[PDB]
Symmetry: C3
Subunit: 556 residues, 3 copies
Amino acid sequence: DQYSIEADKKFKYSVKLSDYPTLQDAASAAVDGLLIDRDYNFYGGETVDFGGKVLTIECKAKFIGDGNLIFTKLGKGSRIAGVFMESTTTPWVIKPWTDDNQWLTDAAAVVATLKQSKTDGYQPTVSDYVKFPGIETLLPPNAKGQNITSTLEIRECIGVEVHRASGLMAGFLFRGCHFCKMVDANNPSGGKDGIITFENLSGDWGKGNYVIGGRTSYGSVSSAQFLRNNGGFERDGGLIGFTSYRAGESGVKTWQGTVGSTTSRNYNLQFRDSVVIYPVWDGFDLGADTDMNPELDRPGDYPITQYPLHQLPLNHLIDNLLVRGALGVGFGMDGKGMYVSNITVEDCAGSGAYLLTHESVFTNIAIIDTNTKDFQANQIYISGACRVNGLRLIGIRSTDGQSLTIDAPNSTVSGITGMVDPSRINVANLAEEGLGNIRANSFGYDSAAIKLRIHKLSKTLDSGALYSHINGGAGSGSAYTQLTAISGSTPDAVSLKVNHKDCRGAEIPFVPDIASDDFIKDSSCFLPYWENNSTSLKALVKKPNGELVRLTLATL
Amino acid sequence: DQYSIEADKKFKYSVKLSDYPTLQDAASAAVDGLLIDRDYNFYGGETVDFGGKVLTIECKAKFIGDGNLIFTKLGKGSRIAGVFMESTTTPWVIKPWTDDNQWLTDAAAVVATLKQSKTDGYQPTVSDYVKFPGIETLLPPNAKGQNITSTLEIRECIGVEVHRASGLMAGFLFRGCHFCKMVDANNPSGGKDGIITFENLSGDWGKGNYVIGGRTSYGSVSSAQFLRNNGGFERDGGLIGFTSYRAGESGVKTWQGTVGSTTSRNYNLQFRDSVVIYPVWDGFDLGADTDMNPELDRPGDYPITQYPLHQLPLNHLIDNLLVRGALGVGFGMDGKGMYVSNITVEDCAGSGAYLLTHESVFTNIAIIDTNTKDFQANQIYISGACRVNGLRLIGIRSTDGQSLTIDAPNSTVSGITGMVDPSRINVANLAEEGLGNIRANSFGYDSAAIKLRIHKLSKTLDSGALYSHINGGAGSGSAYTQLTAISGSTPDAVSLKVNHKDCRGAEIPFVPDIASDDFIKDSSCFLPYWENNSTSLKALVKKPNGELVRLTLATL
Amino acid sequence: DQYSIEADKKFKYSVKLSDYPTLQDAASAAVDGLLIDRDYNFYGGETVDFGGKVLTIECKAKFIGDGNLIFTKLGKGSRIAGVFMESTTTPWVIKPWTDDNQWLTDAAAVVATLKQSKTDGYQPTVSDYVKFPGIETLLPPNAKGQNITSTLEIRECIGVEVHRASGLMAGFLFRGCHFCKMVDANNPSGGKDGIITFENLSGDWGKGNYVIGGRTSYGSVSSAQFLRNNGGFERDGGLIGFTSYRAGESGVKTWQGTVGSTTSRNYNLQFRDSVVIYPVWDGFDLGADTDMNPELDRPGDYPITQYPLHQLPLNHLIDNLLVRGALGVGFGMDGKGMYVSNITVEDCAGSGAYLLTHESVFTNIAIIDTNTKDFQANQIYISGACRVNGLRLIGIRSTDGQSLTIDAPNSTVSGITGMVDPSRINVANLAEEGLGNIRANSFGYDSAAIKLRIHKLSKTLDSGALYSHINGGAGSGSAYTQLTAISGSTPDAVSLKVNHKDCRGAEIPFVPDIASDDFIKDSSCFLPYWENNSTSLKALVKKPNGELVRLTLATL
Ligand SMILES: [Ca+2]
């Protein structure tokens, strides 16, 4: 009895699942620690009440079950580490990529990949019917409408963190939670539902909910997703330092539109320092309104009368994101008044950026080899009146057809770099207002060029140019300078030259027949023209006083 | 007695505060673990001696008290997790922002926000008297000079880490510590003092001290701050992966000048991969010398005779920082020989960057919609002789008045992008030395332009241009090229044209009266001029031998 | 007996090394936790069998020994925290940098730094003989061929994480492991071998192996290195969020060539969000093939017949890296089909980038003050046919000699910024295809310039220019525009002017003697020329029909 007093004071309290027949029995006994030291088969909907206790739950075995294992009434500060969820069912999965990591787009080829596995692919859903046209008819019935996920559901808790979670056909759901985090996810392999979900459709708007660190793979739908969360002006929530691989839908998704009877939208969240690779749909989908066939209202949210479709003041903090390998769109969003910075998107089959934004600013964007399968009309689309300050376009891929590279018809852009085809740029205004003294350095040509193109006149032909051309060969120390203008849709049709053939003179073009009065523009100027009937040059002169006179300029 | 032997060997040692009347009694009993499992009211200055033991302190309740709870004599490798500090006093706080997140600047409006709360605002300090002019007179006495903070003080320890700390009116102070870290701060809400402080005014210069991860909110002064730390050439200290929200002063601060009798300055620290949002003063304040009314000496530091004011070899490693929403300056520093990269600052009421630097290099800087309240003279200021390589300016905001955008009178700059008003650029030298072949693409105009502006001549008017203008309408296949020069402060006053009205000729300007001898510049050139008394063009000719002759060029 | 039942259920299981004579005895007794609470002297090769148990190993003391302490048969999910390795031997180390952090390059100066210490320098190896020419002869024998490292070796384990490791002369080796991580390394000071190594020369290719977070210092060779790892298309492995300081070789290394009888190469790894400072050799060395004296084959890898040397499809995910202070190369790699983004390299004595790549894309690269000791031929080298989209060159350093800045003879580049000497650019093609309307703003000169340079003609002289020059002084409201061409290797030798001396006319250069027929280029143009024998200007006219006629243009 003496020792027991001492022992109760000097040892750390932990209960372990191997000592109990059910998880509730263990939860009930727990005071400080709880060790999961044996695999536990749960039934879908099995619910554990943790009594408001602040528990440190250390997992060293699996939770095995189809459906949801529901944790409730955990005290603020509770932590669950090392959790591993696994389904009982091994479903049919598709694997729409080759052994050289090329995407498969042909429905029949995708069907041929079918296998029963808990990983290395995903269970088809209805969105696959759109993504792979014709697949709905070709999929066997046993591969359609599957619904396998083993989900850890944290329900109506505050201040709970799940650390280093993993699994097979695994999901993690925080339902009606606040100040909860999914930290350092240890590459769970996903199932039918989203891998990591913060859903706050009921109760107060979600706040304080983050994905921090870690990564996921596979899954039928999006890797990380938010419904009805608002981080406040403090931006207390979102996703930082995360990697998503091969989402069956999108890497990171803020939901759009109405779900159930209320809004699924999100405000004031962080999306930073993260990477999405090889999503079947999109890298980041940060829109809040439905694009195609939209609702006429926003129950639970701002009405259309206050903010039109795609013009919500979403106010997310969006910075330093990387997307590679999307089969859909690399980076998509909507909203009004947005600031977005430092986005890098490479090698996507659909548009690199699809931006249904207005009065927003995009700084230091790089869109490098996207729309490679011509799925969309362009590589970067912007609908509304926005500003782009720094835009890198084109890597090493060519474009065979007529699609635009940037179509941002209401936007003002500066700072494009890359080997863009200028005919594939469409913006409201493009300008470099603040360059210093300039040099055009030409490699691999016998000339250097400074060209001008007026898109209203022609998007495909330069309207004038300033050239420098070698006279003779390399090392001659001689070039000629040429000032040109387009005529009859023939670039460089008319030109003045300086030093052609090292002659040290200006070659001046003249009107090839009698110049009309209106040909001359300015006072105190002359326009030479040809009088064939005398073999003479004449000059149409607009005198300093504005009156016209015709003079003889050169004679036989 | 048999079991007790076995039990002492097989169980983890931890003591818990619920078994002791004081925190010292628990600390004294501890061997391995210490669990804080009941709220503990401490008195200011209460000091716990941990006996040099390497303890793992796990907090699941609050430390409650105004003033400092002082931890001493923790062994290297000790860890304190989940600590939650809370004041006993609920002070008066101000909230100088609206329900639409607009800053309040009017003192009377700020006073009207007063409430008693431990969060959602901050206790006024003397710096508020400057920030909100007139507020000193308008604040009620009960809202002035408050001093509420509940501070965990780690004193004279080596190798101690505080993880996942939080609180209300909370602070964390490492005094005279080395190799200590504040890791994954769980959004403590601050009090009167700095939220996270590494202060090494006594003893050896601080080294090995970091803030890694996490975030803070509110507080009256700066969120994270350093005094008398030097990371060594190894750069072993600083701040990485951190977020500061709504600092009452600045997000991240390295102190300047003398504090007490010695230097508060800092060297060789990292500031990387971090974000500061909505500080009342500055985002990052990385200066070491006092700007306004400076000391004539640096006791404990390099003398002015060795390094002039603002020219210390601070040698911080500064990269990948984001600031949004400052009411003061987004990014400020001083020093000589600095390299700074990848800084992004958006939507600040004062200057985006205030750089009292010399012989320093700034690479890939973006300053986007700053000085929005005209608090400073410019958006980015640089005092000394520096280099800027890549500078994005202007988002979507206009500027109504005469303030400069960049004033860097001793600096050489290249790579500006954005819709900057060129009259608002002031630098020593601006150049694009290494561009390739160029094309100017014009949208929304009937012409394209390549303009030249000599700032010594005029900062507001272009001095010459190369234009291409549509002849007729869209699709004509015809344009004219125009080479212009300014005269009488009228841009484009004098010009030569090629292909005006699709005439296929050059329109050449001539001197409107008798040309003086000195009007012609080069040998083997001619200058046409008007002789009104005969209705003739003449030519002032400088012959190949340099001598002048006047010839008749065109006659009736 | 009643209490013992209760106690066995309610307390956390942990054994502690203080209760056992050997580490194996403790490992054998362990069930859940294992506490290292006394220093433990191990013998090189001492091997601990952990029985497949999933153990949480908490270290609060040192493992002391030269050689390897080998951990085997740890269960998936095992974690080792706070480990501290220390050698028994204090070796001789060199410190090739000064008290102002300047690199020492002179062998005799390096030898003079010799001291016996476990840190603050490194043990020489054979690579130092190359790095510091002559040092092999000058080093005393007792400083050559040393081999001191205290290494924690995790052998043939899956799912083991080492967290917050540190030490003196310390190394960490994961041999034949999968799904293992080195997390938040707490600045171990290195020994003779690599600090952190994932080596998978035997068994399956390594996968799931990461360095996440943390930092290292010193060491004789590379800080973090990989052999025979392949992350799969999922990119499940690599290095994220890491800092390396003063590697004796390189910060981060993927091995090249054959080691033993098989490939040491690596595929599909992440290298992101990391920093390397002051390596003696390279920052990042991400090559897979041997550059100098290469193997004729790749046992265990793709044959040369399939992929030529330096053209392996390495497919690493490489983004957001910073290198400063290398004595060798900042960033090096090889491979074909690579995408690389957001690399920043500053202040390196050798090349900033050495890129033996083909059909690869580099986006937003900044190479700022590199090759400062002229160790290589250039600041950035690219061998193969690649694309660079955004390249910042030049900080504040000058270059005295003739070395190139970029030599990328097969690459197409766009978006250079900085005060580059254009004669030091060599590329296949350089272009800005997508600029908007342009303005050249000139500061500190009486003129503004838009220059053209044809590198085939001359890399050192501009071939033509468009200038604007002040007439009179500041505020005159007058400038002249000038269009020039090079002749006899004299820039600006021949020119046309508009508004010289505010004359409002064009000054036109003429051929200084009788123009040859071939001097005129285009039909409907004239070329003025001088007839000295009559003091007349003539015109060589190519009529609209293409035939030549000579006319009198101006007469006495
Ligand atoms: Ca004549």
